Paper text:
Desulfonation of isethionate by the bacterial glycyl radical enzyme (GRE) isethionate sulfite-lyase (IslA) generates sulfite, a substrate for respiration that in turn produces the disease-associated metabolite hydrogen sulfide. IslA belongs to the glycyl radical enzyme (GRE) superfamily, which performs diverse chemical reactions under anaerobic conditions (Backman et al., 2017). As is the case for the core architecture of all characterized GRE eliminases (Backman et al., 2017), IslA is dimeric with each monomer having a buried active site located centrally within a barrel comprised of two five-stranded half β barrels, anti-parallel to each other (β1–10), and surrounded by α helices. Gly805 and Cys468 are 5.2 Å from each other, competent for radical transfer from Gly805 to Cys468, and for the generation of a transient thiyl radical that initiates catalysis on the substrate.
During model refinement, positive difference density was observed in the active site that resembled glycerol, a component of the purification buffer and cryoprotectant. Due to the buried nature of the active site, substrate access channels and product release channels are required. To investigate whether other GREs have a similar channel to that of BSS, we ran an analysis of available GRE structures using the program CAVER 3.0 (Chovancova et al., 2012) and compared channels identified with the toluene channel of BSS. We find an equivalent channel to that in BSS in the two glycerol-bound structures of HypD and IslA. The lengths of these channels range between 14 and 19 Å from the active site to the protein surface. Residues along the channels are highly conserved in each of these four GREs, consistent with these channels playing a functional role. The products, acetaldehyde and sulfite, are released, potentially through a highly conserved channel seen in IslA and other GREs, allowing for the next Ise substrate to bind.
Author numbering: 6 to 830
The structure:
C-alpha cells in the first residue's frame, strides 16, 4: 500500500509538520487557518433587510420588489475587511464560516431551524440568542402564509402529497417522490460574468435605460409587463455598485487604522478596485477577479441558487486579463494564484445552509458545487487549454481546501499534456477534478435547439450540469424519485415497511402468490410508471408555483434574452430560450440488482420461492443469512453482465421514453438524470431490505455507480455497464454521476498516470457524461471513523463534491467505505 499525496499530507498534519505548500501559499494559508474546524454560524442580516423591504411593497411586481429588497440589503448589511485578504465582499456580519437565510423560500422552517439546526446530524449550524430573537420576532412573522414551501405544500393534490410529504405541513419528506424546489431558490446556474468584466453594471444599466426610453407609453404590455422588469434591473445595477462602494469605504477606513505601510497600500488598492468594479469594465487581472467576486457574492444575497451559484469558464474569460498583465510585467504566476486562492477562501467561508430536514439530508458535509470550468473547446471549435488551465489545476493540488468545485471539460482532441495534468491532479487524492464529456452533452444540446457556437461554449454548473448562460432559461428544481421504493411496493402490494399500512403505491397483489417473472415484472412496472406520473404532475405544479414566488433581477440583467424580451428568469417561458429540466432516477444499481436476483434465482433457476425471499426480507435477513449470500450471486449492474444490464437498459428506456412524451406539454425538456446529491442516504433510510441482499435502511447505490461491493470485474466494466444501460437512440436524458474509487497503488507512478489517462479516453469514447475518482486506501477511512479528531482534515469525494469525512453521518460514511476500492485496472 502506497499513500496518495493527500494521505501523506494528513500524516504530516498528525506529526505537526507544516504543509509542504504553505510557504508558497503563505497569505491564503494564514487566511484559512483562522476558520479551521469551526461549525458555521447563521447570519440573519440578508434575511432581515430583505423582509423589511418586501413587507412594505406587497402588491408591486415581484421582480421590482426583489430589486428594492436588494437595495435595502446593500444599504444596511454589515460591510467589513478581513485581515490579510486581498478581496472584498461578504454576505453577512459574521467572522469565519457563515450561512444566510432565505425566508421567501422556506420561512416556515425558521422555528424548527432555530431549535434544531445546532444539533442536526447533517451539516449543523449555530445561531446566537440575539439572532434567534431577530428570526422569530422580525423575520418569520411577515412570511407566515407567504413562503414558497407553504404554497407548494397546499398546491399538491392529495395523491401526489402522500408520495411527497409525511405530514400535512410538508415539514417532513417521505423520500419517495421528493420535491427539491422547496430547499433552494432554483436549480444550479451560471451568470455571464464576462459581460460584467467587459461592460460593467454601468454598461448594462445604460442598455436597460435605453429600453425604458423606447417603451410605448400607451402599450399596456410595455407598461405593466416590461417596465417593472426594466426598472428592477436598473435598480439592481445601482444596488451592487453601492454595495461595492461601501466596501471601498471600509477598506479606506482600515487603511488609515493600519500602521504597516505595505498592508496600508494593499488596502488602498482594494478600495480603488471596489470603486471601479463591478460598475466599470475591469482593467487588469486583479480588477477582473474582484469584479467577478463581487458579482457571485451579491448573487448569494439575491437568491439561494441550487448548489450555490456556479462560476463559469474562469480559465477562458480571465485569460485576456492574465495574458495582458503577464506580457506587461505587472503579474506573475504566483501572484495569479494568490488572487485566485483569496477568492477560494472567501467562498469557503460562505456555507450554503439548508435549514429544512430534507435539505440537510440532501447536502451532507456542508455540500457545495460552485462549479469552476476549465478546458474544453472554444466557441469556434478549437481546443481551449491555456496557461490559466494549468494554474487552476496547480491551485487545486496545493490549496488544501475542497474549494473550488473544479470541473474539467474533456473532448476527443483534448491535448495529451492537459489530460496528463488532469490525471495527476486526480491522483492527489481529494477527488479533483470531476470530468464532463463534450462528446456526450454537445450533440444532445444541439439536437435540442442550441447552436454549435453556444453549445461548444458551455459551462459546467452545479454537480455536473451544463449551462449556456445567454440561452438557458429553465430554473425550477426537479423531482428526486425513489425507484427502489417501486421495488418494495411491488413486493408489498404498494406499501412500504417504513410507512406501514399507508397505501402509497398501486395495489399490485401479494408478491408471495406471484407465479412468473412476467407477473412480478408487471407489478414493478406499475409502480415504476406511477412514480413517473407522480413525478411529472408534481413538476408541472412546481413550475406554476415558482413563477409566483421567485425573481432574479441581477441574474436576469446578466442574461441577453432577459434583457431583450424584458422578462425575469423564473417565469416558465422566455422567448428564444431553451429549457433543460430534470427528474432524478434514484437507486439504479439497487433496482437492477434486486430485479435480476428475482428473475434469476426465483423464476429462472428456481433456487428459492417468492415466499422464502419475502420471509428473508421481512426478517431483514436475520435468520436467513444463507439466502442473503445466495441473493448476492445473481447478476449485478457494473460488471458488463448483459443479464443485469439489459434490465437496467429497459428501466432507463421507460424513464427516458416517458420524459420524451410528457416533457413537451410542460413546455420544457424534463429529462431523466442520475445525479444523487447525498439523497441516496435518506432514500435508502426509507427502503427496507431488498432482494439484492442490501439490508434495510442502508443507502441506495450512488448515482449510476454500481451497488456497493457488487462490481467484481474491474473498473472498466463499470464504464461498459453504464453504456449498456443507456438508450443512445433517444435524447430525453441528462447527466449520470459515476463514482469510481482506486487505491493509490492501482495508479502509482507515471505508468499509473498513463493508465488513468487511457481510462478517461475510454470513458470519453463511450459518450458517458461524467466521472470522478477517489484515490484512497480503505484503512484511511476506517482509521478516520475510529479516531475522527486525528483525521479531521480527511477530504473525500462524495457526489460531485468533496467534504470532510468526519462531517458525514455514519450512513454516508458507510456508503463511502462500502464502495469498491479497485486495486487494479
Amino acid at each position: 500500500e502506497i499513500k496518495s499525496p493527500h494521505e501523506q499530507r494528513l500524516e504530516d498534519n498528525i506529526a505537526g509538520k507544516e504543509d509542504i505548500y504553505r510557504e508558497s501559499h503563505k497569505r491564503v494559508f494564514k487566511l484559512l487557518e483562522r476558520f479551521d474546524g469551526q461549525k458555521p454560524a447563521i447570519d440573519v442580516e440578508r434575511a432581515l433587510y430583505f423582509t423589511q423591504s418586501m413587507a412594505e411593497t406587497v402588491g408591486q411586481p415581484l421582480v421590482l420588489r426583489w430589486a428594492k429588497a436588494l437595495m435595502n440589503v446593500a444599504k444596511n448589511i454589515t460591510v467589513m475587511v478581513q485581515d490579510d485578504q486581498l478581496l472584498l465582499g461578504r454576505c453577512g456580519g459574521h467572522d469565519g464560516r457563515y450561512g444566510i437565510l432565505y425566508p421567501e423560500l422556506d420561512g416556515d422552517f425558521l422555528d424548527i431551524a432555530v431549535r434544531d439546526l445546532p444539533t442536526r446530524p447533517q451539516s449543523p449550524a449555530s445561531i446566537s440568542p440575539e439572532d434567534a430573537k431577530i428570526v422569530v420576532e422580525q423575520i418569520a412573522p411577515f412570511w407566515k402564509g407567504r413562503t414558497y414551501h407553504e404554497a407548494l405544500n397546499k398546491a399538491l393534490p392529495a395523491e401526489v402529497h402522500k408520495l411527497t410529504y409525511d405530514d400535512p405541513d410538508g415539514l417532513i419528506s417521505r423520500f419517495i417522490v421528493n420535491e427539491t424546489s422547496s430547499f433552494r431558490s432554483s436549480i444550479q446556474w451560471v451568470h455571464d460574468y464576462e459581460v460584467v468584466l467587459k461592460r460593467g453594471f454601468n454598461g448594462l444599466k445604460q442598455e436597460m435605460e435605453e429600453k425604458l426610453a423606447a417603451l410605448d407609453p400607451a402599450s399596456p404590455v410595455d407598461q405593466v409587463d416590461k417596465r417593472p422588469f426594466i426598472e428592477a434591473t436598473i435598480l439592481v445595477c445601482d444596488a451592487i455598485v453601492l454595495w461595492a462602494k461601501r466596501h471601498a469605504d471600509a477598506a479606506r477606513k482600515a487603511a488609515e487604522a493600519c500602521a504597516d505601510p505595505v498592508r496600508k497600500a494593499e488596502l488602498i488598492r482594494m478600495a480603488e478596485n471596489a470603486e471601479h468594479v463591478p460598475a466599470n469594465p475591469a482593467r487588469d487581472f486583479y480588477e477582473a477577479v474582484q469584479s467577478q467576486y463581487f458579482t457571485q457574492m451579491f448573487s448569494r444575497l439575491e437568491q439561494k441558487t441550487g448548489t450555490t451559484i456556479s462560476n463559469g469558464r474562469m480559465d477562458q474569460y480571465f485569460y485576456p486579463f492574465y495574458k495582458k498583465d503577464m506580457e506587461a510585467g505587472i503579474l506573475t504566476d504566483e501572484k495569479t494564484l494568490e488572487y485566485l486562492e483569496c477568492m477560494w477562501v472567501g467562498m469557503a467561508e460562505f456555507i450554503d445552509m439548508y435549514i429544512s430536514p430534507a435539505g440537510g439530508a440532501f447536502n451532507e458535509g456542508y455540500a457545495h458545487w460552485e462549479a469552476v470550468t476549465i478546458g474544453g473547446q472554444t466557441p469556434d471549435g478549437r481546443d481551449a487549454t491555456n496557461d490559466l488551465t494549468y494554474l487552476f489545476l496547480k491551485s487545486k493540488r496545493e490549496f488544501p481546501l475542497h474549494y473550488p468545485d473544479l470541473a474539467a471539460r474533456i473532448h476527443s482532441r483534448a491535448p495529451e499534456r492537459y489530460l496528463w495534468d488532469v490525471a495527476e491532479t486526480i491522483k492527489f487524492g481529494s477527488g479533483f477534478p470531476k470530468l464532463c464529456n463534450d462528446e456526450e452533452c454537445i450533440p444532445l444540446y444541439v439536437s435540442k435547439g442550441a447552436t454549435f457556437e453556444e453549445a461548444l461554449d458551455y459551462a459546467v454548473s452545479g454537480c455536473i450540469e451544463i449551462r449556456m448562460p445567454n440561452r438557458d432559461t429553465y430554473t425550477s428544481g426537479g423531482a428526486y424519485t425513489n425507484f427502489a421504493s417501486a421495488v418494495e411496493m411491488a413486493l408489498y402490494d404498494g406499501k412500504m415497511k417504513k410507512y406501514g399500512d399507508v397505501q402509497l403505491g398501486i395495489q399490485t397483489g401479494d408478491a408471495r402468490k406471484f407465479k412468473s417473472w412476467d407477473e412480478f415484472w408487471n407489478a414493478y412496472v406499475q409502480q415504476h410508471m406511477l412514480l413517473l406520473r407522480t413525478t411529472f404532475i408534481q413538476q408541472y405544479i412546481v413550475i406554476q408555483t415558482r413563477a409566483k414566488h421567485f425573481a432574479q433581477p441581477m441574474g436576469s440583467v446578466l442574461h441577453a434574452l432577459c434583457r431583450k424580451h424584458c422578462i425575469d428568469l423564473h417565469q416558465p417561458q422566455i422567448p428564444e430560450g431553451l429549457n433543460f429540466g430534470y427528474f432524478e432516477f434514484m437507486g439504479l444499481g439497487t433496482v437492477i440488482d434486486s430485479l435480476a436476483a428475482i428473475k434469476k434465482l426465483v423464476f429462472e433457476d428456481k433456487k428459492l420461492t417468492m415466499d422464502q425471499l419475502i420471509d428473508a426480507l421481512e426478517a431483514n435477513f436475520e435468520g436467513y443469512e444463507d439466502i442473503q449470500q445466495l441473493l448476492r450471486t445473481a447478476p449485478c449492474y457494473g460488471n458488463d453482465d448483459e443479464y443485469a444490464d439489459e434490465i437496467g437498459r429497459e428501466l432507463d428506456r421507460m424513464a427516458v421514453s416517458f420524459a420524451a412524451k410528457y416533457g413537451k406539454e410542460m413546455g420544457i425538456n424534463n429529462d431523466a438524470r442520475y445525479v444523487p446529491f447525498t439523497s441516496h442516504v435518506p432514500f435508502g433510510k426509507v427502503v427496507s431490505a431488498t432482494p439484492n441482499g442490501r439490508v434495510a435502511w442502508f443507502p441506495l447505490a450512488d448515482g449510476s455507480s454500481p451497488s456497493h461491493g457488487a462490481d467484481h470485474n474491474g473498473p472498466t466494466a463499470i464504464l461498459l455497464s453504464n453504456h449498456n444501460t443507456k438508450n443512445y437512440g433517444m435524447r430525453a436524458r441528462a447527466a449520470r454521476l459515476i463514482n469510481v474509487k482506486f487505491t493509490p497503488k492501482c495508479v502509482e507512478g507515471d505508468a499509473g498516470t498513463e493508465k488513468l489517462v487511457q481510462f478517461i479516453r475510454t470513458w470519453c469514447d463511450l459518450k458517458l457524461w461524467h466521472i470522478q475518482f477517489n484515490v484512497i486506501n480503505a484503512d484511511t477511512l476506517k482509521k478516520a471513523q475510529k479516531d475522527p479528531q486525528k483525521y479531521r482534515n480527511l477530504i473525500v469525494r462524495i457526489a460531485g463534491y468533496s467534504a470532510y469525512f468526519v462531517d458525514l453521518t455514519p450512513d454516508l460514511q458507510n456508503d463511502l467505505i462500502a464502495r469498491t476500492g479497485h486495486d487494479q485496472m
